[PDB]
Amino acid sequence: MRGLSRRVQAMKPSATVAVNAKALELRRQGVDLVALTAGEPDFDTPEHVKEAARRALAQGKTKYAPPAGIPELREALAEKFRRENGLSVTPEETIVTVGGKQALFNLFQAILDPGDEVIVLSPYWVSYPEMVRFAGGVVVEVETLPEEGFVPDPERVRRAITPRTKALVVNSPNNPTGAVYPKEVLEALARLAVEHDFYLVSDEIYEHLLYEGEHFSPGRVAPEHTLTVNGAAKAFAMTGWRIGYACGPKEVIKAMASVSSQSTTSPDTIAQWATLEALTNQEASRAFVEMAREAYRRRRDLLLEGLTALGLKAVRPSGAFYVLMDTSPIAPDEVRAAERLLEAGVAVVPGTDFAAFGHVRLSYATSEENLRKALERFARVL
Amino acid sequence: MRGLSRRVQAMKPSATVAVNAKALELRRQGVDLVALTAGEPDFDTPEHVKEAARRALAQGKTKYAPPAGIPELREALAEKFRRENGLSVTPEETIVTVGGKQALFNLFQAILDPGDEVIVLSPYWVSYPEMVRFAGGVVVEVETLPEEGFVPDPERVRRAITPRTKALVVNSPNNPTGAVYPKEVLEALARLAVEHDFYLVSDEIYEHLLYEGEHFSPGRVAPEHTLTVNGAAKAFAMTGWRIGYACGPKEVIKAMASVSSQSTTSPDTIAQWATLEALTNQEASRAFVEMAREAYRRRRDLLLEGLTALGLKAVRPSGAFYVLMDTSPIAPDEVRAAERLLEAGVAVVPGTDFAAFGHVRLSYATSEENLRKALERFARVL
Ligand SMILES: Cc1ncc(COP(=O)(O)O)c(CN)c1O
Ligand SMILES: Cc1ncc(COP(=O)(O)O)c(CN)c1O
């Protein structure tokens, strides 16, 4: 017989991706709207990275790369995790994937048997629950509170652990909250994984878009229980290049490259060499990162001051480029609230699927002009 | 508890990929060996395609593309399947994936429930069985005979159909056999799918590397049951670019883009624009294709004549760039036979995992010099 599988029938395709398409299609309709839905830098990818790509193209580096990635990138990855994060990985405990998303997807497909539980901290990124269930696992949510700055309380987390717990997913800096969890809290979560024997999956793609505090890698504390996921996407404005990377226990990494060989073979060879440049050319990349960070910081402060002045509540973010705004003043719920905003000319992502009810997610990864323009419309809505 | 999943523990990572790494590492050791294991063109990707890429880089086309692919490529895809294959698809029934492999992987994840059977014709490509089982399906093998030119007998196929049959996988031109199935046989297989109500998955990536006969797309006969898989990899020497495409029933295509959104988001944006050029610039691409085909043809004939002279058997291929060679004269089995050849300085892929026992797979996608050099070593082994 014909027909789709149950797993695909159960799955929700990316909600953030979906709302972006809608806001983009509305502008084609000539509709004047300010989109605050983007989850990607407005800056183009730095020139040094583009040159590395042109150089690869010219050198004929267009053939298949190994499932785990070109050796050269793996060595630079080992160096980056070591130098920037304190992790003691070897190139063999490193892997390159089609974006950080495929690092996570291949991760779950490699460690989840049907029924295995995965603890997810809410508000969580739209994709965690979907990937966990597509692999057959069960999502166990542990709540994070705004009054606690959206930082996890390791005690609420311990109370959600069961004999079925296979993994715990931490994301700092956080999407959609923008929170940066303290070293102490991360060490605590890392200890729970060691004590109870399960995997800590640390999603660090926003590590460089930090404005206050410091970035701590739990993998320093629990090295054989931790899988660190990262990527070139946010740090270098390389979202469309599709290059992510991860490190951790050699056996899990080796399992992940196996899934890669039977699905995508390996990521784009040109994009791989381009990324090698972003990582090794420290002077040039550090320069881009410093420049983008200060621009985002400047946009964060601008946005937050405006919300405060309009009497809209929002926990002050310390990383990433998102803000969860309490929509109570606008409507009784995020869906109706997001509808009103769209009608006022501003597109936001409702917090429904992030489990951030009563809130809406804003992105300050656009021009100051757009931010100011959005703030005016918020005003009239109120 | 910690531990890998049972599905990943059951899976065999790509065998062809593995033997290539070994032959490549041996040459680094300074070992003098001729590798006939490659499954990729020796030609670099044509200039027009590289230019389209440079133009995209320069225009800042580095952001996320939609899960199904940039609209422009989908429209050109609809035009290609229509113009080149006789398929009546629309852009909405088209999808771009990270290589043809992800088209197939996402396919099976979207239509296979545990226990669903998928008929696979042997010798089959190493990855079909692995992908089928990773999604929970069961592989039902239907044998193809050398004495019948490795062309499937639709009657043996009908006798393998059961109430559990969800799909049938056809691959023409074929890897590893190089056989090109006749229009009649393809129409017959397409009818079985309609009659018994199941999916026909037609893997056509080698459509342009055809030396004798014509390429028929079964999707013309059973359009609502067929999923045509293809890619830029073989036709344009774009293996490392990771761009594949497929068309078929809108609901299945839409399910495939959903899996993409929760795994890789979308393929490389730069590689997508590069591919748009390969498809629309017909004069330039047609020129590359004609040139490469005649070079492969010239290498096929060279290889085959040499085998014939050494008294080694092999069915004469009409497409792709592989040849299944009967290794009886060399050893009692492909594994021992592949071992002897390696020591004689020639690396081949044993037919074990292709279910082509007693055979070894050779690739004539290298210089005439390499082919001649390999033929000398075959001589001394005998
Ligand atoms: C929290 C989080 N983790 C992982 C990713 C993966 O990103 P990509 O596929 O673009 O690397 C994203 C995308 N922004 C993200 O927001
Ligand atoms: C029979 C067959 N089908 C599909 C593919 C997919 O190729 P790719 O991922 O490089 O597009 C290949 C690779 N050569 C193949 O041999």
Curated annotation (Swiss-Prot), chains A, B:
GO CC entries: cytoplasm
Subunit structure: Homodimer.
Name of the molecule in the record: Aspartate/prephenate aminotransferase
Bridged cysteine pairs (disulfide): none
Entry keyword Transcription regulation: no
Modified residues (N6-(pyridoxal phosphate)lysine): K234
EC number: 2.6.1.1, 2.6.1.78
Catalysis: reaction(s): L-aspartate + 2-oxoglutarate = oxaloacetate + L-glutamate; L-arogenate + oxaloacetate = prephenate + L-aspartate
Function in brief: Catalyzes the reversible conversion of aspartate and 2-oxoglutarate to glutamate and oxaloacetate. Can also transaminate prephenate in the presence of aspartate.
Coiled coil: none
Marked site (Important for prephenate aminotransferase activity) residue numbers: K12
Annotated GO biological process: amino acid metabolic process; biosynthetic process
Highest taxon of source: Bacteria
An annotated Gene Ontology molecular function: pyridoxal phosphate binding
Keyword Membrane: no
Cellular compartments annotated: Cytoplasm
Cofactor(s) for this UniProt protein: pyridoxal 5'-phosphate
Any matching Pfam family: Aminotran_1_2
